[PDB]
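ping. complex inputs:
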Amino acid sequence: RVIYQFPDNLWWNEASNQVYYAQDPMKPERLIGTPSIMQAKLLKILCEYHPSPCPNDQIIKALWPHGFISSESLTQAIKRTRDFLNDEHKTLIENVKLQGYRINIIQVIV
Amino acid sequence: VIYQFPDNLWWNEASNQVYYAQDPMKPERLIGTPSIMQAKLLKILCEYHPSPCPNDQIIKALWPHGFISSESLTQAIKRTRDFLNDEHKTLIENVKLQGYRINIIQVIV
Amino acid sequence: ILLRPVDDLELTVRSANCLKAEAIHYIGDLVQRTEVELLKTPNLGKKSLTEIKDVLASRGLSLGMRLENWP
Amino acid sequence: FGIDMNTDHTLEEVGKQFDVTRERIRQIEAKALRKLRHPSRSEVLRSFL
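pong. complex structure:
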């Protein structure tokens, strides 16, 4: 069981894959829900590289290894992924130009 | 490679992050990721140390391909001073007719 | 006019900077290139290109002509 | 330089025109000088050598 903490008391439980709000990681309070398989993919690419930024080419290759996909698809994926993780202030995942995207992780429980 | 500056400022080149921390392995207050040419300038300042870097070489490194207006040099330095919150010019010192020098407390390899 | 160097056009330091970075030295080299080829130059944006167009059109010249056996 | 004027002036009273600053007057004059040196607006003056 691997669980990741995000700012504003957010948690994501990967093994069962639930995003939620909870003061206690073992006791959820408000369940945001289940991210999609490609959404979990997106958080995977942002998560395996912390604290280093994940380059745009690497995430694009990983998400769609066999698809002719434009970078606009990656960017709208980030946007409509914020649509689900409710990061209105762009603080959960930071976009730094010509260097890629990052996700702010407070702690990891394994 | 891990660089310490005055006032407990830690820069990690592998992850390329700068932050305030008493313990290098435990960030306390994150400043963040400098831009590309900021990284080039920091690496130049850390790579001629102890000696300072002449202006021609930093000019040729920050913008090699095209000769650039001179002010940009100083202006780039300003931002590299400002992002590292070096208001007192103690992290980047300028030696007249000698170049630009950086202050490193220690390096962790 | 085809035998003057680029600086005669009196370009903004941004422009002359960019065109000197791509080894575009002669107005023939300016004209034989097209708008899209210039817009692909790094740091050469749309408004820079439009002011190049205005200034070059001041001197009775335009972009995109084909000059045989240049130079 | 004193063109169309009785006396020549140094950087001080040239600054006294709008803003009393020396290095700005120098840099303005130098910019004007390299701008005039441009071969496009100097052929009429080169003929006086």
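The radius of gyration of chain B is 14 Å.
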